[PDB]
Amino acid sequence: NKVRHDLSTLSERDIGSLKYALSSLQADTSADGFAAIASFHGLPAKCNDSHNNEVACCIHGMPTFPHWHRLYTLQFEQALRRHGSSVAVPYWDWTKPIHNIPHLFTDKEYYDVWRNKVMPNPFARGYVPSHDTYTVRDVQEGLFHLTSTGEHSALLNQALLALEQHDYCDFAVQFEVMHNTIHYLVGGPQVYSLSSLHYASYDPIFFI
């Protein structure tokens, strides 16, 4: 049903579809909609039930953890598809060193269109309606990866080590940690960001 491509690989046409779809995603008020979809990851915590006693929905530090997030991505992908996205959500290959933050996400304004209208880039960010706060990202330049090999970045090393593990459990432990890095990188100190458990789901980078 769907193919996933790298962000860099995405063509303008492909990205354009994504650009619009997210915009429409944002619009979707419904539960399927983005605002609702985000809450699945964390705050507000609906997880045990709507009841006051609540915990974060996502499973972390648990072997279930990769399962949950994997499922989570599909939810978005389906949402975009409904929205009319031509392609599966792209993944931002963190492992490779990043000369600069990907253009699709980075550009605050999505100028290109036949219309040549200027608009905000839904990809760039979103806001949290409950908090009525806005997403923010504090990123470290260090992310631009430098390494002796050059190829073997910390992420690459960490990911690879996890890769060599028959034990799933062992794999997950290593697997999750590598995953953690990006949240820290983008979020930075910002309370409302990827760095935060509850807030992080809001940023669109999350899906990528």
């Binding site: 303008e12 046409r13 290109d112 036949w114 040549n116």
Partner: protein
């Protein structure tokens, strides 16, 4: 509209095949050479209006005959 034009395009293709039978080259058009060269908008107007690369390259009608393109 799309469905209809598809049929009409289909018949046009039919004509081309008949021409081949005739021995006239199907791709080649003898007539209205001047018009064929000119590119057709908005196909010629690429992005942002026309994302499609193929139609853009194809905008010249001369190129259009070989549907296989």
């Amino acid at each position: 509209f799309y469905i209809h034009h598809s049929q009409t395009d289909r018949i046009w293709a039919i004509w081309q095949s008949l021409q081949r039978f005739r021995g006239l080259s199907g791709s080649e058009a003898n007539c209205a050479v001047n018009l064929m060269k000119t590119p057709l908008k908005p196909f010629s107007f690429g992005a942002p209006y026309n994302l499609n690369d193929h139609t853009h390259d194809f905008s010249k009608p001369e190129d259009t005959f070989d549907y296989q393109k």
